[PDB]
From a paper:
As an alternative, we turned to the KtrAΔCB complex, which is formed by wild-type KtrB and a C-terminal domain truncated form of KtrA (KtrAΔC). This KtrA form lacks residues 145 to 222 that correspond to the whole C-terminal domain. Thus, the stimulatory effect of ATP is abolished in KtrAΔCB, leading us to conclude that this complex is trapped in a low-activity state. As in the KtrAB-ATP and TrkHA structures, the asymmetric unit contains two membrane–protein dimers associated with opposing faces of an octameric RCK ring. Importantly, we could establish that KtrAΔCB-ADP and KtrAB-ADP are structurally similar and distinct from KtrAB-ATP. Importantly, the KtrAΔC ring is asymmetrically expanded along the diagonal defined by the tip contacts, revealing that in the KtrAB complex the ligand-dependent conformational change of the RCK ring occurs along the tip contacts. In the tip contact KtrA subunits, the Cα-Cα distance F71 distance increases from ~68 Å (KtrAB-ATP) to ~87 Å (KtrAΔCB-ADP), and for L66, from ~50 to ~76 Å. The position of the cytosolic end of the M1 transmembrane helix in repeat D2 (M1D2) in the averaged density is clearly different from the one seen in the KtrAB-ATP structure; the need for a positional adjustment of the helix is also detectable in a difference map. As a result of this conformational change, the M1D2 helix in KtrAΔCB-ADP has been straightened while in KtrAB-ATP it is bent towards the cytosolic pore. In addition, while all other KtrB helices are visible in the averaged electron-density map (including the pore helices and the M3 helices of repeats D2, D3, and D4), there is no density for the two helices just before M1D2, M3D1, and the D1-D2 loop helix; in KtrAB-ATP, these two helices, together with M1D2, form a domain-like structure (the D1-D2 domain) that functions as a KtrB foot on the tip contact.
Numbering used by the authors:
A (entry chain C), B (entry chain G), C (entry chain A), D (entry chain E): 7 to 140, 149 to 282
E (entry chain I), F (entry chain J): 15 to 445
The structure:
Amino acid sequence: KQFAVIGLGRFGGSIVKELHRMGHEVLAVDINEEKVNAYASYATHAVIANATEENELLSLGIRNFEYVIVAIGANIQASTLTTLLLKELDIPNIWVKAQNYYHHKVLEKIGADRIIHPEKDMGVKIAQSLSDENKQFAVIGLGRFGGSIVKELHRMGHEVLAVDINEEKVNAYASYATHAVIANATEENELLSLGIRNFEYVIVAIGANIQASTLTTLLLKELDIPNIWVKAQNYYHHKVLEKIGADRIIHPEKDMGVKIAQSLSDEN
Amino acid sequence: KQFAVIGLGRFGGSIVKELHRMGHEVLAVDINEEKVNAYASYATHAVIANATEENELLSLGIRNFEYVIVAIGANIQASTLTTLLLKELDIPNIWVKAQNYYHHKVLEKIGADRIIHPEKDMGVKIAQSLSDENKQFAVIGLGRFGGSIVKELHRMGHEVLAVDINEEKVNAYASYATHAVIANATEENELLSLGIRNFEYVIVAIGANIQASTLTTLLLKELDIPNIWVKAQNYYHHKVLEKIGADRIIHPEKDMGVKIAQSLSDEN
Amino acid sequence: KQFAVIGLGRFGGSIVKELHRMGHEVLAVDINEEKVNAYASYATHAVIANATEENELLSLGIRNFEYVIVAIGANIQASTLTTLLLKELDIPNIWVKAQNYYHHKVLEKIGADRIIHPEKDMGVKIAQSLSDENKQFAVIGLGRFGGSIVKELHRMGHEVLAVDINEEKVNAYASYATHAVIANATEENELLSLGIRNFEYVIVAIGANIQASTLTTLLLKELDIPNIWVKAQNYYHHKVLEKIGADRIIHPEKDMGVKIAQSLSDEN
Amino acid sequence: KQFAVIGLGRFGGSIVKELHRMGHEVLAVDINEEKVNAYASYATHAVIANATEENELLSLGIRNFEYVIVAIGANIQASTLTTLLLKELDIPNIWVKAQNYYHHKVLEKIGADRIIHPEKDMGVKIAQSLSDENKQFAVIGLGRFGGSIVKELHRMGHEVLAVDINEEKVNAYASYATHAVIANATEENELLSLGIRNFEYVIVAIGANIQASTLTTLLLKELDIPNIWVKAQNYYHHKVLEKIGADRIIHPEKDMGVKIAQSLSDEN
Amino acid sequence: TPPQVLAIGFFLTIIIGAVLLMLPISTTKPLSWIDALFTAASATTVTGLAVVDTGTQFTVFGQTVIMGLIQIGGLGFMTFAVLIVMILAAAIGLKERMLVQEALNQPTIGGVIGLVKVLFLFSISIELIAALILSIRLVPQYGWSSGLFASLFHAISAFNNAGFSLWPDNLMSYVGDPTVNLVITFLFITGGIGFTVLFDVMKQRRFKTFSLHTALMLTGTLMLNAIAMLTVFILEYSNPGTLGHLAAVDKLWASYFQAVTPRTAGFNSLDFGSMREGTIVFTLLLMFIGAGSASTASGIKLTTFIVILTSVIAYLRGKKETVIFRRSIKYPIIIKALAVSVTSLFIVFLGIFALTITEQAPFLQIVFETFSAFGTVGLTMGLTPELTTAGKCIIIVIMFIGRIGPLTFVFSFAATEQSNIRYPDGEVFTG
Amino acid sequence: TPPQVLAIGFFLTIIIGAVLLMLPISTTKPLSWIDALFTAASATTVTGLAVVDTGTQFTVFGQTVIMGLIQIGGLGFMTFAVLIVMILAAAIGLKERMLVQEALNQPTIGGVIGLVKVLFLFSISIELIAALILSIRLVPQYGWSSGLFASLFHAISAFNNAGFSLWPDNLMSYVGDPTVNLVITFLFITGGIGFTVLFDVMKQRRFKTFSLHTALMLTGTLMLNAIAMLTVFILEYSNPGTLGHLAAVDKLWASYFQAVTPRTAGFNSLDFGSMREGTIVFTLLLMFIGAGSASTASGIKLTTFIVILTSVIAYLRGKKETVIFRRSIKYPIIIKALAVSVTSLFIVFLGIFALTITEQAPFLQIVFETFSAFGTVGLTMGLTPELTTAGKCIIIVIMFIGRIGPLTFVFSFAATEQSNIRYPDGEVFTG
Ligand SMILES: [K+]
Ligand SMILES: [K+]
């Protein structure tokens, strides 16, 4: 019944927006006000505060909330200390957004009732969408997301043509995919020589350099790729990728929040 | 009759390709071979050499060519020294691609029979295409190209809403346009507040950062801008900008070469 | 009696070296082997292992050690998770090297029997050395170290001419020093205009850019500054600063380890 | 009798300062005023102007000067166009500072009565100082300067242990020195293994990264190297290198100007 | 909203109160419709002017309702609106926290509800102990029916910088009274200095640990007063009318008080209608510049002056920046200072202009009246009683605009416009 | 140096000239040592004040030497020092080019020698053709001994904005003279607008291609005059003393001229000693703000006003920057404007203060005299002749400081200090 999300990042913001949509009270709150302002009408209560300060957690009657969500990215200590303080107020169910592997472990020994990996957990879901969607699978960009799909699909037992720009990643994924390949998705001859045309499902998970994500999907749409799924970064990336011909765009942080906002709702 | 183009850059390449099309002998030649290879069937004679070396100019019977074209970009000294050597062989008409203003002057005292500014000279032509095309004119990005259009259109006597990201340029163009504005074409409120919607002809000349060129045209197409003309950088930029809704795309270097390839042809 | 130091950084290395000197058993151990190698004869037992793995902590009979030292810098999670695992093996007294403020808090709720701030805790000691050393005090570079001296000296009740390159820090130290000044120690006129010549004790705590630390001390020695104390980074910094005329050089990480290696010794 | 130096760079500044010292009229002049200001009492006439503009050359009665010096570095076109304009006013003897090889050629076809390579021409002089100074020769850093010494000394017939950080240069100097070696002067084992201790004359010509120049000389002085000659960059580099034990410091740009200021004086 | 609320809101306390006194109970002689909406506005603005006398015209009902109006604005309009929600209810969100941040000049909103208790409570604190105790020391003369009241009525007016005196002789009767000059001055002085300097010196209490602002006030405050006592004493020394013939000690109680009362105090130790022309001048400027920010009334707070002036003192030299007490002053403070500066003047000028024609009165008095009117100074060269009707409505606006501050007042009916696009440089000379 | 030179230099033309007229040849009646170093300083400053009448007291020698002094400063002090090195010699380095860049308000030094010829030559150009031709049209009445001179003497004073009239009735005799009001107004108006707007409109001549500054002047200049003629006409309409009884057409020649003469013109179409108090007021402000930068005289040039005011108008709204004619105004122009603004006031106040005690005169006249004195306006409520000695020395400094501009004047004895080190933020309220 009592919902409160700390940290209005892309993830923490996609939960205060979804829960409010469904019609559930959401005590949104972030460190600064820049975000807290845009979410003044996206939550039951928009508050500007720092989750590391005790008096701020108390004064906000945060103790009445059975479901606390620590979505503060970056500064891991911010994510930790918060969950740490939360577990002290005997918060029933604390859900936290971990960054790396160790964040998972540490947050697990603190008392985190649940940890979510936006990039990771999403890939597995997509790896489930591509499977129930039909044969030829290929994922470009072995980032955290693109890596969680080559790992999941291979698990299920589906051919996955994994491939990233450098080899550092392609090496660790030599036995995590049907075919590990080191190449650059922007070069034509490399896309052709890789018989990428035989793949009905192409996944552009290359983060950072948006142009890399775009140009790739651009080249892909030229080879008449049946269904191209791409990982967009910001809003505009969505638009541009949509006019290119992207058969599907995924927002790891965004799309995940809505799912959690559904897990916290059906949880009571 | 005798045609020879030095430097197979984007410009020097659009001339060896065009002249060969018309059916005129073209002694294409660049410093390295990377380009000279792709132009083996795009010119009467593909040669790999350095225009600064004497023996290489002589051995290539370059003296028999009445029309020499120095399109070697970058290293200005390469462009200069070449024209310098050329003028020594009493080359009838030497046409050279100047980079900056001073390049114009120096190349003029050397004996350059003709100097071309791909970016500059092209803008004036477009400024002529937009004029004979019909009222509301606005050019985004005051680069060399975008600056040669706000200067020409204002000359003709047409309203030009000049505007660039910073102010450094917008300042020098305060009396070169109906309205000099300092703004960023990626921000919505800035496009709206500038009543950019009343302009039937928008010109995105922002070079470098392609995304800047794209996103802008993207926003423009949203305001239902009648005719949006954009300056593309590379091939892919052409494609992507074409799927966005760009009413027209211009390649300063490319489109200019074809025109010159027409000036050298009708010149004899 | 049982001593073991995890993480052979500059700090963790200055403790395994000092304790072994005194004649105390030291179970040195770092993640990689690069360091563990050079410390094969600097500790009772040099071991290559990762403090986050359980089986590695157990197999190393780490449970028999009453004094565990987590000096692993950088990756805070490494520092945390370790102390976390340590507190599970009921380690009597766990001493950990915290990085930032929050690291202090979190490490405090885990069970850290002691936390040390190499940069911070050292400054206070020096602020005690400069006080018992005699009037005019001035500290350049408000880093973590240079900031812990302007704060301590002002506490005792001594004039402190705090001053850093930018203003970001100089602002937070407006009421933490007799005089907060924003300036660059490399410029002469700025050193003069600040009457820095009247200061018998100058402290160059500017980290990072060694040249900044050097050139400053260099300029300082020219104004015939009585006693110039400088914060050296690496070994060579020590040498070069020594030939310049540095009246005193301090290694926050190094010099602190020896002190702790003295606290652990006299502690039993 | 009539002396005028254009471009107050490090070189052009060491000539207006030296000639004025001797007691000769010097029409100092640079593009901006920043330099022209500090040289108001270092020349018969300090003028702020641009050598590319005609009216500025005329209005400055530059035609009355028999000796014009174009020391404007960087923008080669500035160095060229100037000499170009100068040769038009029938300037008796125009001396210009060339940057690279091609600058030499082009400036030679313009009419440059003399071209000087500060870095190059200086090395040959030093290569003459080290020769008449006495057996074991070794030059570190194959920059333009360090390269003009390994080339000159080998010419005379003296053993030269050439050596630079990378191999790119060390390759072209395989037959330009008694022993071409690829190494980093900051590493000890590399200095020892190269029997550098047997060399009575070590030359640190590594430009850029001053620390490289310093640390090296620092290590050198430790091996008790008889006479260490180092290439300093700025003023402070001089001081610091002087307190390290540098048996000699050379300022390619500076020391050369004084020599030229001696050539122009004895030239009439 | 924060601005408007203090605009139209403070406007009602004047109207409502303009009838709370125009009532047959508080008025002996007929109170014309004009001389009623005035005197009621002067007290609420803590200005010090009145068409009709005080202690006389008004009964014990018209003298008590004046203390209530002189208190309302004595701390601001929102300083009493957030105190009626904590002693009767409790708990207040970030919706009302943005209102008292505009009635006491505060750059912070996240914490202005809890203070509400302290301010008013602390108000009636130093107001009682310094009035009914230290001011009833030498005033019990008139008995208890006029000694108990007259000693409590002037404190709520003294500490609040009001200028509303009971007896017709606006304190003019106590020329050299040691208790008066000492007791009342301490009231409007401190009560005059921004609440900051008030609160600051309290918990800080350190001779050095005083913030730029607080540290400023004390210096400028005292320092200036010295230049004030020196001026009044040098010009009104031989003046046979006032001070000129007073003894040796009584001459200091006049120069001092008269050099401290222009600080929007409103008390007369002598008479301004009989002093060297020069003196009156220095005053127009001495009353123009109020005293303190959070203060308790003023047209252009002392701080503004210092900044504007000193900031210019730096220009004439070279300092690329305006640095005070080795704690430089950011750029913003400059522009705002200028704004608040030119505004007060631009307006006061509009008044001096819209009055010289409205009523046939001298010029010196027409200018002295305006400056004092916009700065709620209280000192009147004897033109307040003889103010026509036409010149009243407008004058009522002056005091209204002056007390409400030219800035926080203009933000109300000012459609805030946000420019997102920059423009080309605009060269222009002014030397 | 650039500043000092114009400071102590312009100071000598006043002294040397104060003896060029005190000579028995140019003075009929004895010219006291006091009323000699004054009238000679008023003409050189082109101020419009004089202890002794003009056309009378002075002979043909005391009326010719006045036109020479009214010309010297009519273009600046360094506008005549670089004109004696090109017509007699030629060639000038970058050493003297930095002096005329401070006497005509120029942000450039690399080119102020060549112009020297044009300025003065162009001066005596419009001064002759508009005086001996258009001003000798309706003045040949007094014959050739007084019709030829009287028509040339007023132009060197009209175009230069001087206020020095021949006949005792400072043009007051020509109330509705079409030639006078039309001829002389065009002289001090244009001569008044900065040399820029003068030179600009010349080669530019385009209705749009006028730089920010130039474009400004024209608008503000004319626009303001409209508010000026409207003011003087509405207040002095029924005034039986002046204009009030003039016909229908003669009422416009008074309102117009009187609304254009305060621009440091110095001519009287009527009498300021007999006009509604309100009118005189608007004037103090209308004469405070001069007219144009490069102009020919003024205390605080029009431009400064616009900026300061408008800049504030932007604050009350929101525009993060002060943008004019869609050509934003850089930050610097703001601070300097403020400086020049507060300076003129701070000083004029020091005068109005140091005069009310020096001489027993009315207050309205003591303030009108000061503003006019610092802005070399020429209009005097009839107190100039009755100026005591004590109030003269100081008054001579006013006109001196005003004409020399408060900025370029303060840079002389101002030890320029350069701060290289920054300091911590300094919070301070002022609302
Ligand atoms: K008052
Ligand atoms: K005048």
